[PDB]
Write a protein that binds this DNA or RNA. Structure first.
Lengths: 129, 150, 91, 25, 48, 81, 155, 97
RNA sequence: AGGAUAGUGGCCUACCAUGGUUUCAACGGGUAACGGGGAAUAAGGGUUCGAUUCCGGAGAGGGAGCCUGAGAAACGGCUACC
RNA sequence: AGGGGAUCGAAGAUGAUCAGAUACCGUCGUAGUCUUAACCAUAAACUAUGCCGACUAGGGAUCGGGUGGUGUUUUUUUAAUGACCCACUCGGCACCUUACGAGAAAUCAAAGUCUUUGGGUUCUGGGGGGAGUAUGGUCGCAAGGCUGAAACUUAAAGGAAUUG
């Protein structure tokens, strides 16, 4: 059965990006998903996306700009100490100058650089580069 | 899907986006409620009531026309059943199959289906006992099962 | 508590006569001493008097049956066959 | 030698082993 | 996927599985069985 | 096609596909106003009636349940609403 | 508490060194010692006006509460004035970066000032050794619903 | 289809279970239908039929014994005959069967 | 409830109840097991070792008992047995 | 264990063949094959591909259900209703082409979305033998099933393809 709507969303976005499509449909598109897309859209990896209101948890259409190499979840959402973020970034990102590891902290969903700026930590959601 | 099968059918109702009553609907909510209670007095299950309301009347959705669902209306009017509808029909099916097995002790397909129906009964009863719809230590004992459905 | 693992009613025979003979006897004595449904009054009160005689404790009706069971499979088959022959003869 | 015949001859040997050990016991 | 439990609360299963599967290793089995102490001409020594 | 309007599909494309797989799922059934000659009452019947429906006045059968849409009786008029 | 045959033993039960003088009489006709245990735990009114003695009660007995304050779920109420609680917790295994469910059973003395059922959530306070295994006394029953009041039967 | 009609009578109306109260209601002319189990003894069912003919009462022969007639009336004991004294919103009386 | 103890405590005794642990591994068995600080190796994660320079425990051929003394069930104290 | 027992046919008996030939081939023929009531619980029990979920490619058939056509066809030739045709759709057994992808390859539409390594979960393996053996336990009437070592030995065994 469905166990992670975030994982489904990011796998769908990866498959669309690899096939070269410039749009992708996401269902059921929760609000953790909306926050993750807002982080990707802030850093420019996706374009505009619009939420489609059915009365059954919704859908999202995402415009892709071709800049995405790989977005994915880390399941389970491991707890990360403030000093282990560097271990996660070293394992998951292709370089040190670009790419983000997305955390869920009590201060909100954010990328690892913003987490370092606010000196917060939490659980790991996924990555984008 | 298909908890006890390999089937993968997606057949189901697709209720409309609109949560308001249809513009062509004229009957009052209290008229729909009194029709529901008449059907319940006749011994009709909530699903049968919904079917008759949808077909003979114009009641697209009881929750839409009224503010409440059919079982909620029945429980407010005191017509709640001793056990819930779906568990009732599962127990009745198990009673039918075991009655058949008594006459047909070599129907191993029937024995297999009986095991599946029993396990479905126990799972749904576990849920109902968890949400306190059924009293605690309610049990399907399969020997006085016909007592629970008459 | 469970007093015997497998001998059941044949525990009266101790260790003699052989386990296979005791098992055959166990099957037929369980059948022979069971209580059976009355086809007339509907109660579970039919017991064997002597081989082939089955009497209901209430309604006092006696039926001829099998040596160790109320009805044998042969007798049931014969009852069905006789019913079928009767039906075609009468129709 | 064929595997099922390894199995068969081994089974016969296990019968003989059981027989001699039951004799001892 | 991948045939192993990834749950954050599956540490006991992962640990017990590793413990069970280490017995297929030659050196781990010899060490945990005390093979040199039991059946080795040298009782685990270099010379005799 | 690598580029398409998932947000604004053509009405034909949405009508050609399954009710659960449109952009927003919705029913394809409807309700009918049905009138019988031997009376003047109008009865509302579901398109997929699933039960033989009679009018409130007299016990004349208006529909017969089938596997899909319910067949309407030979001598009856109806108006899609 | 107030009821249930306080003097049902071979020995007379009384709180030590609290004397009721038959020379002068008052309204209550009996002196009962009690106190609040501290740490914000309220002495129950059943303890306040009960008749039990229970020298091991943290509110009317001779024991005091100090050390660790634990919480648990009642899993057995079959001993006399003693229960066992279950404390569930998650133990970290660093190699796998994961957790495993773990539990301990803690035998706890319960005052007759309390009424506890299997499944209730209780908070227990550490005291001096009470028996061979018991080191904790019930000091408050944190069952606002107890996950049983609305789930058990209703006649 | 008689089991649900009978069960709705048991829920909503008034009935008597048993030979003695059935015959009593038959003489008092209160019964409107009697259901007789299949394994009812023939003398008893003939006498119930005579009583019903004198009282102009409907007779229905249950296709089953007293065990499952008792089951059909929501009971844990055997019932040989059921008499309906006044059916509620059931159609068991107006229905021929 | 009492006895004993420096004191709590089935520590022991009398009476009473039938309890307590366990697949979240009890209980039993093995350890070529004293525990730890630590050691070796190691991108990261790990693996193996730790009798042994410090800390804690235990013992003084094997058991048991005890005097003295604040402190010992001591052994470069005593008593008995092997 | 009872019934049945035509056929075929372990064992066995025979005729050939053969150096031998209680093998293949021929003629018979017991158990068995069938059935009722109990056991057994194993197969290359195979798709040698666990189950649930999501997404990713072109195509035409087919089975079951449903929707539409002012389509054909049947007694009367839209006027008492199936079969067929066309276009969709859900579900299924599959198939063809190609692999963008995967793989050691054979190949694969999953065996893809896997060093750009994490959707959930169960079970199994750790060079070849010894060995599914010994022993203990347990189930079975038995045959045997399930669980299951060690000593010792050894440099390959094995997979898929290429040329001969």
């Amino acid at each position: 059965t469905r166990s992670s709507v975030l994982a489904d969303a990011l796998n769908a976005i990866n498959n669309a990006e690899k096939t070269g499509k410039r749009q992708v449909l996401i269902r059921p598109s929760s609000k953790v998903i909306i926050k993750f897309l807002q982080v990707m859209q802030k850093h420019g990896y996706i374009g505009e996306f619009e939420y489609i209101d059915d009365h059954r948890s919704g859908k999202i259409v995402v415009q892709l700009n071709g800049r995405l190499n790989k977005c994915g979840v880390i399941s389970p959402r491991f707890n990360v100490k403030i000093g282990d973020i560097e271990k996660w970034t070293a394992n998951l990102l292709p370089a040190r100058q670009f790419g983000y590891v997305i955390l869920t902290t009590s201060a909100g969903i954010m990328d690892h650089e913003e987490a370092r700026r606010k000196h917060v930590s939490g659980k790991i959601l996924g990555f984008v580069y | 899907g298909r908890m006890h099968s390999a089937g993968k059918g997606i057949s189901s109702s697709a209720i409309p986006y609109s949560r308001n009553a249809p513009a062509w609907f004229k009957l009052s909510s209290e008229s729909v409620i009194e029709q529901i209670v008449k059907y319940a007095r006749k011994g009709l299950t909530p699903s049968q009531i919904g079917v008759l309301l949808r077909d003979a009347h114009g009641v697209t959705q009881a929750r839409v026309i009224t503010g409440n669902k059919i079982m909620r209306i029945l429980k407010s009017n005191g017509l709640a059943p001793e056990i819930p509808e779906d568990l009732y029909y599962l127990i009745k099916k198990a009673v039918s199959v075991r009655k058949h097995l008594e006459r047909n002790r070599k129907d191993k397909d029937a024995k297999f289906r009986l095991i599946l129906i029993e396990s479905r009964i126990h799972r749904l009863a576990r849920y109902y006992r968890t949400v306190a719809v059924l009293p605690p230590n309610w049990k399907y004992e399969s020997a006085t099962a016909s007592a629970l459905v008459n | 508590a469970k007093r015997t693992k497998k001998v059941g009613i044949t525990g009266k025979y101790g260790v003699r006569y052989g386990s296979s003979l005791r098992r055959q006897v166990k099957k037929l004595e369980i059948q022979q001493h069971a209580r059976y449904d009355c086809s007339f009054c509907g109660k579970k009160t039919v017991k064997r008097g002597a081989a082939g005689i089955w009497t209901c404790s209430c309604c006092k009706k006696t039926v001829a049956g099998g040596a160790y069971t109320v009805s044998t499979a042969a007798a049931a088959t014969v009852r069905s066959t006789i019913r079928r022959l009767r039906e075609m003869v009468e129709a | 030698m064929r595997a099922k015949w390894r199995k068969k001859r081994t089974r016969r040997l296990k019968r003989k082993r059981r027989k001699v050990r039951a004799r001892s016991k | 996927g991948k045939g192993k439990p990834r749950g954050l609360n599956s540490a006991r299963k992962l640990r017990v599985h590793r413990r069970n599967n280490r017995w297929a290793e030659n050196n781990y089995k010899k060490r945990l069985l005390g093979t040199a102490f039991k059946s080795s001409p040298f009782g685990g020594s270099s010379h005799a | 096609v690598l580029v398409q309007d998932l947000l604004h599909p053509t009405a034909a494309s949405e009508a050609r596909k399954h009710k659960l797989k449109t952009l927003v799922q919705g029913p394809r059934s409807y309700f009918l106003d049905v009138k019988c000659p031997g009376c003047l009452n109008i009865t509302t019947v579901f398109s997929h009636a699933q039960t033989a429906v009679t009018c409130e006045s007299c016990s004349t059968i208006l529909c017969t349940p089938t596997g899909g849409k319910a067949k309407l009786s030979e001598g009856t008029s109806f108006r899609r609403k | 508490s107030t009821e249930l045959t306080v003097q049902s033993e071979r020995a007379f039960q009384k709180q030590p060194h609290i004397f009721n003088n038959p020379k002068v009489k008052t309204s209550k006709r009996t002196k009962r010692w009690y106190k609040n245990a501290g740490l914000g735990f309220k002495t129950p009114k059943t303890a306040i006006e009960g008749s039990y003695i229970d020298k091991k009660c943290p509110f009317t007995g001779l024991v005091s509460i100090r050390g660790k304050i634990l919480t648990g779920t009642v899993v057995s109420t079959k001993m006399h004035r003693t229960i066992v609680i279950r404390r569930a917790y998650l133990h970290y295994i660093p190699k796998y970066n994961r957790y495993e469910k773990r539990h301990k059973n803690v035998p706890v003395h319960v005052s007759p000032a309390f009424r506890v059922q299997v499944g209730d959530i209780v908070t227990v306070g550490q005291c001096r050794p009470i028996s061979k295994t018991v080191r904790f006394n019930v000091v408050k029953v944190s069952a606002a619903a107890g996950k049983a009041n609305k789930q058990f039967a209703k006649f | 289809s008689i089991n649900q009609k009978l069960a709705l009578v048991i829920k909503s109306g008034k009935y008597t279970l048993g030979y003695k109260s059935t015959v009593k209601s038959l003489r008092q002319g209160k019964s409107k239908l009697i259901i007789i189990a299949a394994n009812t003894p023939v003398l008893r069912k003939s006498e119930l039929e005579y009583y019903a003919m004198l009282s102009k009462t409907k007779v229905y022969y249950f296709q089953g014994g007293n065990n499952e007639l008792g089951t059909a009336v929501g009971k844990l004991f055997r019932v040989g005959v059921v008499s309906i004294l006044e059916a509620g919103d059931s159609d068991i009386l107006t229905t021929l069967a």
